Amino acid sequence: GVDIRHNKDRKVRRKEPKSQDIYLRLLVKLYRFLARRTNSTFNQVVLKRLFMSRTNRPPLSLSRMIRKMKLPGRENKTAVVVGTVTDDVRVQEVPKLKVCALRVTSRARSRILKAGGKILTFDQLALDSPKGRGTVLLSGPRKGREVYRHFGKAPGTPHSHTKPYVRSKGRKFERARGRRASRGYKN
Amino acid sequence: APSRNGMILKPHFHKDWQRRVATWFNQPARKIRRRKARQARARRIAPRPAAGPIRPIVRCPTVRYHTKVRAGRGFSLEELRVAGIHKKVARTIGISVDPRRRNKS
Amino acid sequence: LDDLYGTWRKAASLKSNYNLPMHKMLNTDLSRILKSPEIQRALRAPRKKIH
Amino acid sequence: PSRLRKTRKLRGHVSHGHGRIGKHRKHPGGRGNAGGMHHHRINFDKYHPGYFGKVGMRHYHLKRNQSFCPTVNLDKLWTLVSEQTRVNAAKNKTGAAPIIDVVRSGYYKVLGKGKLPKQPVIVKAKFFSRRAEEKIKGVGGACVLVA
Amino acid sequence: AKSKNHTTHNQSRKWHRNGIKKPRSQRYESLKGVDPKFLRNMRFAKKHNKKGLKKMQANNAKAMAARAEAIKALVVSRKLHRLAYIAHPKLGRRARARIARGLR
RNA sequence: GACGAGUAGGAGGGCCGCUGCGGUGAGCCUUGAAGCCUAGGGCGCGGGCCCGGGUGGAGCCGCCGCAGGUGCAGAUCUUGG
RNA sequence: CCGGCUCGCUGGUGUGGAGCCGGGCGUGGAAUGCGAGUGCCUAGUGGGCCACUUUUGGUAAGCAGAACUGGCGCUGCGGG
RNA sequence: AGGGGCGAAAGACUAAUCGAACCAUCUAGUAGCUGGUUCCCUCCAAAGUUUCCCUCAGGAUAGCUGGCGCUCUCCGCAGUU
RNA sequence: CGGCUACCCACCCGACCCGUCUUGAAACACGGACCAAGGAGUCUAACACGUGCGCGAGUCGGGGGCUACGAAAGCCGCCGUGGCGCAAUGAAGGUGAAGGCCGGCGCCGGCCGAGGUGGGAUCCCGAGGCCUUCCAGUCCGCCGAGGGCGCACCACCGGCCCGUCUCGCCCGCCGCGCCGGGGAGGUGGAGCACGAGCGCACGUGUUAGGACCCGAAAGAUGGUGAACUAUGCC
RNA sequence: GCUAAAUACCGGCACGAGACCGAUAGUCAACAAGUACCGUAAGGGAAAGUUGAAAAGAACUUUGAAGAGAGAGUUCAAGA
């Protein structure tokens, strides 16, 4: 035989979206063609993020893209987000933007158009730029989900700040024994 | 035998809850019954308002809701006597009256 | 129908707050998109020689 | 639906996905949270610290309305009033400042967290944080207390 | 009802199945557990680093000028080798052109 | 191109199987449906399936989705023979 | 390695040390082989046994108890 | 008349049931203990070991396992020397 | 004449009866005469994780109301009351989430304004070059030494918020008080540091429920028996 | 001390419906079912549906005492 172990002989990476959305699959077909027939890896990254699930493409806020496009050098570029561009209310002045996203909320798009921006989908983004030249690829905070507060080193352990699963935060709920140096021990 | 990580739960199912359980399979039927009784009442009092008598302006007691104004139980006797409306005729003409309401304002 | 479900630029006049859902893509004609000079120009040479 | 559940593919396997050495008995570890102090000590200490014991004082008749006091931040402070208020105040030449009655919106306490735009305001609230008030004073404005 | 007490037979195989990986060393190790007085000194130094900026900028400018003027002041067998030179695409183009003309 | 073992266990594909529901086949059917038998012709690795012959006389199936009281060799299993 | 700052710590001594910036050096500094790293949910398990060599109790045991490695368990096949 | 009756006393008899009768209900009482646990194919693939428990026929917790992925490439890692 | 396959027979090799417990099963281990039909992880609720859809710092009409299939479906918005999220910390009184620079006398006016480092997919610039006779030569592209602004994310250094400890000097007044506020340096927190949640559906895991199916020795409540028998009496 | 309304309903009367069950299922009971049957009693408690469209339920002959056959006849079909 062979001295080969098959623990990791199969890659776990995706090859297609797990959704039956026909519009998404049509965009997948377009970028599949672009990725396999162009030398630019931007299409390949967009194709990967298209394959990714809902939680792997968190909704990028308006504030993040404003701060990231405000960086010097990337003037009048094309901000491309594979996820969703959501309105952020803690901002007053919105500069002119070049936004390419799968979907934008009803008032965020109104705010950008009022500010003088332009929202274009991926089908017209391909026509504007096949290889994605003159574009900045942005992603939302993937660790921003509240579930990540519960992950990592276990709670009730020294040097471990992990949120415990408590049915109701309060005085009587998981506060006495493992949390205090008086009632036994504290970590 | 709790699992690795998760909440601690105290469900209140240790009694014989199946013996006393109420199901809402009659919810639409009860809605229709209320609607028919309401319409029958409305046509019974042909010119009178469907909602009934008139209730006064009232703001909620607690601190959480002292900035909101709701509907009252009835008009106070002091308010009625200022308005010159008798306590026995107010209900006849369709004015809600409850003698327990005070007026500290 | 327009007063019921609203136009793209005019919201529904009979619903409290509703508007037509925005398209994920506008130009759905994939063949027309692919067979355009803009995309075909920025492409690599095909390799249809089976080995 | 039961069509897609694992039990449909467990037919033909004797143990039905529960093991052959240690059978799926009824309650091998007691009922519910049994033995948290005795044989589940490791789990209840590695995942539920502070679970055992009392702490603090006891408030017998607790009413939430007395302690009801929602809070808002200065970044969302302008969101309460309409956009045309802010643009007209910015365009205004006589120096008149808009009055924001946060109580009418439904917030009693104002906390100063975000950046406040350079524009005079009159915040009429029930409570103020020290940093919130100093930010309003620094940006130029007034604070009005109401009961 | 006796039974064996302790065993460490298959443990090594269990460990090496996933590999006994060393901890992943990472640059800029944390500063926990150091002498508090030394830690206070370091934090004060990082706190007051800002004021000594203009002198640092001037020294950097002088050094850059010094290096700028410094750089301104400074500024097998032969038959096989021949055939390899001809066979090379870029440097053998003229040789291949001449031998093509030689065939004609 | 490389590889192919497997208990407990996990995952995926089932144009594998049963019952009913919403759509669909100008579907089938007293010029014969279901069921049953068959030394018949086959297909699919396999779950199983399609035709041929005999009884039957009144209902039956394929595809797309939905739902489950949905698959037996045992349990000193239950009932009947 | 080369310069320049910061320090409320320690000091004869711009001493000591640490931190922070700027500049330069690619023959990528043993062999061999291999794509790696990282995060969640989780079944089953938690009675073992045998063999070379090391070895404890017992005279000895197809005995009882340990260490490394490999197997049976979970495994068919050729030989005994 | 049942935790009662009766017993020249054997825990004897109390409707073939007596060291606590019979019937119905609570009750589908609990079981860390036995028995069984229903169609196919493909892929991956174990442990009987650490610690704690009135713990020793069991659990919790590490370890072993599988699934889902994700961040990068065409520097890193190693049951080796 | 062909038909491997499905019927029977003959021969050669192999070939212990299944299930289950067990380290070890063909076992002198237990269940099993045969056949047909039924038959065992389902449902409710809670939580967690992952995936699909809608909306998005909002989200949800689940309760109520208005208008054969239809007990459906649509609508309410001054029916979003309310749940979850948007703020945490403290037992509580409560508090509650950047700063730097300039001029005048700790205070006043103006300016810059919402962290830094290392690694960072992608993007931007371009020392030159990609030939059809050769030279200069432009336009559209393509590759590329090197240099950048650096997604997400990881690690570290910072900063801010609440409780606490120490050293402290100031500031304010309607009631100058056992008043209130502010700094620096350590420390504890399920925190902030330019959102990511809400609703519905699916799968998995755990739990309380009869809870995968069958199984006790027992306990309690209410009633029926001296037609056998035990004993007393007539 | 009285008082309708909105509220509860697995008993009862009369109704409508079902992504339910289809005679070992579904109520114990689709039928002369709480009937037969067992226990002194309290109580326990079943099995059991399908001729044919219409009985047109097989005239009449023949062996046997008859059960029951052999012909004949009814029916599309007694292979009902």
Ligand SMILES: [Mg+2]
């Ligand atoms: Mg092989």
Ligand SMILES: [Mg+2]
């Ligand atoms: Mg794997």
Ligand SMILES: [Mg+2]
């Ligand atoms: Mg477990």
Ligand SMILES: [Mg+2]
């Ligand atoms: Mg009313």
Ligand SMILES: [Mg+2]
């Ligand atoms: Mg198995």
Ligand SMILES: [Mg+2]
């Ligand atoms: Mg078993």
Ligand SMILES: [Mg+2]
């Ligand atoms: Mg177990």
Ligand SMILES: [Mg+2]
């Ligand atoms: Mg269980």
Ligand SMILES: [Mg+2]
């Ligand atoms: Mg103990």
Ligand SMILES: [Mg+2]
């Ligand atoms: Mg295999």
Ligand SMILES: [Mg+2]
């Ligand atoms: Mg059914």
Ligand SMILES: [Mg+2]
């Ligand atoms: Mg046969």
Ligand SMILES: [Mg+2]
């Ligand atoms: Mg008929």
Ligand SMILES: [Mg+2]
């Ligand atoms: Mg059987």
Ligand SMILES: [Mg+2]
């Ligand atoms: Mg399992």
Ligand SMILES: [Mg+2]
């Ligand atoms: Mg065991």
